[PDB]
Design a protein around this ligand. Structure first.
Ligand SMILES: CCCCCCCC(=O)SCCNC(=O)CCNC(=O)[C@H](O)C(C)(C)COP(=O)(O)OP(=O)(O)OC[C@H]1O[C@@H](n2cnc3c(N)ncnc32)[C@H](O)[C@@H]1OP(=O)(O)O
Ligand SMILES: CCCCCCCC(=O)SCCNC(=O)CCNC(=O)[C@H](O)C(C)(C)COP(=O)(O)OP(=O)(O)OC[C@H]1O[C@@H](n2cnc3c(N)ncnc32)[C@H](O)[C@@H]1OP(=O)(O)O
Ligand code: NA
Ligand code: NA
Lengths: 358, 358
């Protein structure tokens, strides 16, 4: 029996910050509403493409793991905002870092995609000949947003997180996972007209609907994640008190609290950074894991519960058993190109077109 | 030790057919050039979205396997032309067929994506609790094409293929596989400006370049596939004479012939249907497998070699050991909505815009 230890962790958050106050400047909303309903105070807006955020997060995770590029056998980028469809952006990350040979693909399961990626890489490694893997959740969700619609415009941000996995005999990394999808929730969270369903030559094709039914999402998410978390704990013989840390998707602070409350997990076990970054979809979990490690929230040998959901409606949970090391082997000087523009400056063209079309 | 038997197979080719003669009607090309250089005589153009082609192929594979929707635990759609990015289209296929619960994701590794999907589902099933899986290669490549540029406009078509996998103790299905990516070939085959790298509000954003360096692709593809096929055969203890059938990606007939020639595999072992459908990217392999089965090309207990490449430049090979059954359990009456339009009629809006912009 082999296992896939999380030997490296890393993040990349773009510098330009869109505050709740900044959103109040061009929308009928407030810090008071956004903060009390969602827990979000700020989020980051990328001046660079999704693959660039991915690459930097990967660079940090690679130094953290001390793994050479020659040893990386698999690259998975979990994203729903890739630079290109042809080719995939896993191959761009591969190109940027000079990784020869590795299998490289993009995985789309919306915000659950990192957990899907961790599950997928772990089983690939357990069943076949992949020595080390790079799994990245990376998003530039700001691409998609409708800057007239306050319901969604205030919820999402940009960023990336990465892990490196290393094959081992030790019983560490992802243990049981349960991933799934509630396809009856497919239409409640959707941008149906970006992709090959859109009219390529219509000049109004940029003004797509972001469909979003918050109450219905909340309900299906809590059920999806909750039942997945229960299957993981039940199958693994864990009592709930044995869970040391929860690393949840950062969609809404109330969803995190409800998940923990219904499962009987203490609220202070959940790592929350949604106030800083908002919902970064596939990046939420690996960024939260990275920061949990950075801030001393995870001890050697801890049991972690990861839980996530997203458009689909995809869902999942998993149990990670941490090994010996919670400290990086090395640091990276990798950074995004500098940018002195505000988040408002970056969104100007997009905001002005959306408001003019209305 | 478990294995993932291919218990179901199925295809969906849209009816509207673009002949080489039809391409001669609006481009400086000929049947004589296209047929002798590529082997392509016809290809299909979809009147429906990628998810619809996927669904029908899935329906045929499900009846072929005799598996209920309740038993399907995993859905992978390999595609680079999804209807939507949010949500994924694996979840649409899931919705269409009423499959509850299953993990559902889109996998993007261009034409190698089906092989990536087969590898991924097989290892998921071997290492964890997935009883049956649905793996689909589905594409509407006609969305992307530059109807002024003859180099690429004549090469690609639309379609989908599916398999159903069933967990078993018997040593059948995918055995060894070797998948990878040659990221130094990333820029030779690319549509860099469809995705989040495109300017959403530019009215000319629909007139994207399809970058394509045929000679360089040919060379990297032959090397990529060839070395992957060698690693598969070497690791598995197979002599080349023991390979009964080759199911190759249908990009170019000369690439198939060169692959077989350099490996010392007899040319008549390769199944070729590129003359009918062209390059359908991720759909090529599962459609060719489905048709090989339909036409009596595969016997019980045969050894198959699958080989593929695509944008990335992704590559791979695998060895499938066939089990007992080469005949479907049941048939499906599932079909696409009727369409009496020609391929030319369907492409009219796209062709007229491309030619007017030039
Ligand atoms: C671009 C990337 C997209 C792809 C994403 C992929 C990743 C994912 O899928 S993760 C998906 C994220 N999921 C979530 O955020 C969870 C969904 N749930 C929620 O957000 C919550 O239900 C939430 C906060 C909206 C509920 O708020 P609620 O309790 O209804 O507040 P309440 O006091 O009742 O007021 C509601 C009203 O406020 C108003 N309102 C909405 N937005 C705002 C705003 N920004 N400012 C002021 N008022 C607002 C509306 O009129 C709303 O009415 P209704 O609820 O009928 O639409
Ligand atoms: C939407 C799709 C997105 C992609 C999704 C992912 C799928 C994949 O990644 S699979 C990729 C598929 N790969 C391929 O098709 C590669 C196959 N190989 C080739 O294309 C060959 O090299 C091929 C067909 C060009 C043959 O070359 P070859 O016979 O050696 O050269 P030759 O006989 O001199 O002809 C080439 C010349 O013909 C001309 N020519 C090109 N197209 C045409 C045409 N349609 N009609 C007439 N002449 C043409 C060109 O001037 C070309 O010049 P150059 O020498 O500069 O390339
Ligand atoms: Na514990
Ligand atoms: Na044989």
């Amino acid at each position: 029996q082999c296992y896939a230890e999380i030997t490296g962790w890393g993040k990349c958050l773009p510098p330009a910050t869109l505050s709740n106050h900044d959103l109040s400047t061009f929308l009928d909303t407030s810090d008071e509403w956004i903060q009390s309903r969602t827990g979000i105070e700020q989020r980051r807006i990328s001046h660079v493409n999704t693959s660039d955020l991915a690459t930097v997060a990967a660079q940090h995770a690679i130094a953290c793991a001390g793994v050479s590029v020659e040893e990386i056998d698999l690259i998975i980028v979990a994203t729903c905002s890739p630079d290109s469809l042809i080719p995939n952006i896993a191959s761009r990350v591969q190109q940027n870092l000079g990784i020869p040979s590795a299998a490289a693909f993009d995985l789309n399961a919306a915000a659950t995609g990192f957990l899907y990626g961790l599950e997928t890489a772990t089983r690939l490694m357990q069943a076949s000949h992949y020595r080390h893997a790079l799994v990245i959740g990376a998003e530039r969700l700001s691409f998609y947003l409708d800057w007239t619609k306050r319901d969604t415009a205030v919820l999402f941000g940009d960023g990336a997180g990465a892990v490196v996995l290393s094959k081992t005999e030790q019983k560490v990394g992802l243990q049981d996972a349960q991933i799934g999808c509630d396809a009856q929730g497919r239409d409640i969270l959707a941008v149906p007209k970006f992709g090959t369903a859109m009219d390529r030559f219509d000049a109004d094709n940029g003004y797509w609907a972001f469909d979003f039914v918050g109450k219905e999402i909340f309900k299906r998410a809590v059920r999806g994640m909750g039942a997945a978390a229960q299957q993981v704990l039940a199958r693994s013989g864990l009592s709930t008190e044995e869970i040391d840390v929860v690393i949840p998707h950062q969609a809404n602070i109330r969803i995190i609290q409800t998940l923990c409350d219904l499962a009987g997990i203490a609220q202070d076990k959940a790592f929350v950074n949604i106030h800083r970054y908002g919902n970064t979809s596939a990046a939420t979990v690996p960024i939260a894991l990275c920061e949990a490690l950075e801030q001393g929230k995870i001890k050697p040998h801890d049991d972690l519960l990861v839980a996530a959901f997203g458009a689909g409606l995809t869902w999942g949970a998993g149990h990670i058993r941490w090994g010996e090391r919670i400290t990086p082997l090395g640091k990276s000087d990798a950074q995004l190109p500098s940018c002195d523009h505000t988040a408002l400056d970056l969104l100007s063209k997009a905001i002005e077109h959306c408001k003019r079309h209305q």
